[PDB]
């Protein structure tokens, strides 16, 4: 419809561009991904693992990725500036493991030969914002230890490790646990803390799954025993709370059908999260989201990138 | 819109004024609070903690308070007869710690310096129902122990302490937990019991958050490790059940948008609580509230105090 006339009739304002990360706001980059191009990327359900992916669909600045050899029911959407996708050949050049297409074996797979056999085009390197050609996030080296909130069970702060580093980001892993609980972040993340923070704050720390003698959990000796260092405290930066206010309007991907983006409103706020309401829909579909999530955008993003915008219902 | 005409097409009745506490019903007091006045008061999210607050908005007998130095996203509404706000200078005169405005440290803060520098007016003392000028409640002293219901998890009766006393109310704190679960009450609260109550009544007692041998928690041992005594059994004088009947109508603050007061109905009753239904709205919006809560009021309260009433729908 038009944002302009909507704002007049509702007597409302949009969340200003300045409130968003540059990466959530940028509209002027073209999407150079094309149908059938091949690449590598993380599995959103197993964020430590990398698979061969194909571009199955492009919509504006977004793309839908298919896991080669597997079912289309696993396909998922990302933005073209996603740091979670990488060019063909990246895994080998940066020390990562590639899970091959269904029916291959890790060491059976070669990009040269795969491309010959498929006659497919690898997505060109220059498309990717993350190629491990930037120097890491200061002070966060693989194997180092920290305390982290289990984003799945937010009342728990837990023994955790850095297991992956890529450009300005690193992977937080829970000791003795599935990669299912892992998550990517950067040194300003509000979900991470230096070794000792729990003790110094009052809260209990959850030790590694099936550790010997859990209440008697000692960090400086866990550390000596694992040949690990804790991430230095000077490394952990303070992300300031976001400045979104209740009733500001924006555009947000609909988690019920991620192909769609909708007119939305800020229904509530915490320091680092906002509660999203889709205008014209039930408050039952209202949901909490991290302010820095890739799937929230300023008003006009859809229009400038060429993605349909769902008007209010 | 009028109450009479509604009570007619609905063949319904309003909760009589006599069912309410004097403080919930009183309409003839003027709201003397004015924009920009400064005061002290508790953080509702952290009810043990005191901050400098400014009057941000007034609406009838209510006001919106702002935490000096912090974001407007934390502002909250109270009634002008709230006992959880106090005049400038009250913290120092009564033994309370004052969390200073965002940049400061406790001991750096002085009101005389602050008022000189801001050119602001402190809310006059005569406006405050609670300034610690009344006799402390009879039996309940700071440091004394008791058993208390966790209002956030009402199946649990837990080990607790009195940590603050102001006029006839005191602050119930759950040992070893932060203050987010704490609450203010008086000697007649149905949520508090003496040490020994759970054992005498056959109910399980929840020990302090990280108590070493929680299976062997014992009160007479805890009291000796902590040098404390129990609030005397005789001090607990529970209030009688309220007399609100299902279908009676009244006015209630909307929990999801606290600026608004709406037409309401009693959907269901317990001895000390009522279930509020907002007329014309989904029953999914229905909520349980203590009958003495400051944000329910007799029909006519909005009209008599100068606050808008939202009609049903």
Curated annotation (Swiss-Prot), chains A, B:
It is found in: Nucleus. Transmembrane segments: none annotated. Widely expressed. Expression is reduced in colorectal cancer cell line SW480 and promyelocytic leukemia cell line HL-60. Ubiquitinated in a VCP/p97-dependent way following DNA damage, leading to its removal from DNA damage sites, promoting accessibility of H4K20me2 mark for DNA repair protein TP53BP1, which is then recruited to DNA damage sites. Changing residue 153 to A: Abolishes binding to monomethylated and dimethylated peptides. Residues 174-181 are annotated as: Interaction with monomethylated and dimethylated peptides. MBT repeats lie at residues 1-101, 109-208, 217-312. The record marks 153 as: Positioned at the entrance of MBT 2 and is required for recognition of monomethylated and dimethylated peptides. The record marks 150 as: Mediates recognition of monomethylated and dimethylated peptides. Changing residue 158 to F/R: Strongly impairs binding to monomethylated and dimethylated peptides. Signal peptide: none annotated. Changing residue 67 to A: Does not affect binding to monomethylated and dimethylated peptides. The MBT repeat 2 specifically recognizes and binds monomethylated and dimethylated proteins. In contrast, it does not bind trimethylated proteins. The MBT repeat 1 does not bind methylated peptides but inserts a proline ring in a Pro-Ser-Ser/Thr sequence context. The L3MBTL1 locus is imprinted. Paternal inherited gene is expressed, while the maternal inherited gene is silenced. Homodimer. Interacts with RB1/RB (when monomethylated at 'Lys-860'). Interacts with p53/TP53 (when monomethylated at 'Lys-382'). Interacts with CBX3, ETV6, KMT5A and VCP/p97. Polycomb group (PcG) protein that specifically recognizes and binds mono- and dimethyllysine residues on target proteins, thereby acting as a 'reader' of a network of post-translational modifications. PcG proteins maintain the transcriptionally repressive state of genes: acts as a chromatin compaction factor by recognizing and binding mono- and dimethylated histone H1b/H1-4 at 'Lys-26' (H1bK26me1 and H1bK26me2) and histone H4 at 'Lys-20' (H4K20me1 and H4K20me2), leading to condense chromatin and repress transcription. This is Lethal(3)malignant brain tumor-like protein 1. It comes from Homo sapiens. The chain holds residues 274 to 586 of 840 of the full protein.
């Amino acid at each position: 419809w038009s944002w302009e006339s909507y704002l007049e009739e509702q007597k409302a304002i949009t969340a200003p561009v300045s409130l968003f990360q540059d990466s959530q706001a940028v509209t002027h980059n073209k999407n150079g991904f094309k149908l059938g191009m091949k690449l590598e990327g993380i599995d959103p359900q197993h964020p430590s693992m990398y698979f061969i992916l194909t571009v199955a669909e492009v919509c504006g600045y977004r793309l839908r990725l298919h896991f080669d050899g597997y079912s289309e029911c696993h396909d998922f959407w990302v933005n073209a500036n996603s740091p979670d996708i990488h060019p063909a050949g990246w895994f080998e050049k940066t020390g990562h493991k590639l899970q091959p297409p269904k029916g291959y074996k890790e060491e059976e797979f070669s990009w040269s030969q795969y491309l010959r056999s498929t006659r497919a085009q690898a997505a060109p390197k220059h498309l990717f914002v993350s190629q491990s050609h930037s120097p890491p996030p200061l002070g966060f080296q693989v194997g180092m230890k920290l305390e982290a909130v289990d984003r799945m069970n937010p009342s728990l702060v837990c023994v955790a490790s850095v297991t992956d580093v890529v450009d300005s980001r690193f992977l937080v892993h829970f000791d003795n646990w599935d990669d299912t609980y892992d998550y990517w972040c950067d040194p300003s993340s509000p979900y991470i803390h230096p070794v000792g923070w729990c003790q110094k704050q009052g809260k209990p720390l959850t030790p590694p799954q099936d550790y010997p003698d859990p209440d008697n959990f000692c960090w400086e000796k866990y550390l000596e025993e694992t040949g690990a260092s804790a991430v230095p405290t000077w490394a952990f930066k303070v992300r300031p709370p976001h400045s979104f206010l209740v009733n500001m309007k924006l555009e947000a991907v609909d988690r019920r059908n991620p192909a769609l983006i909708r007119v939305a409103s800020v229904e509530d706020v915490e320091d680092h999260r906002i509660k999203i309401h889709f205008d014209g829909w039930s408050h039952g579909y209202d949901f909490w989201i991290d302010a820095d999530h890739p799937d929230i955008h300023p008003a006009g993003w859809c229009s400038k990138t060429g993605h349909p915008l769902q008007p209010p219902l």
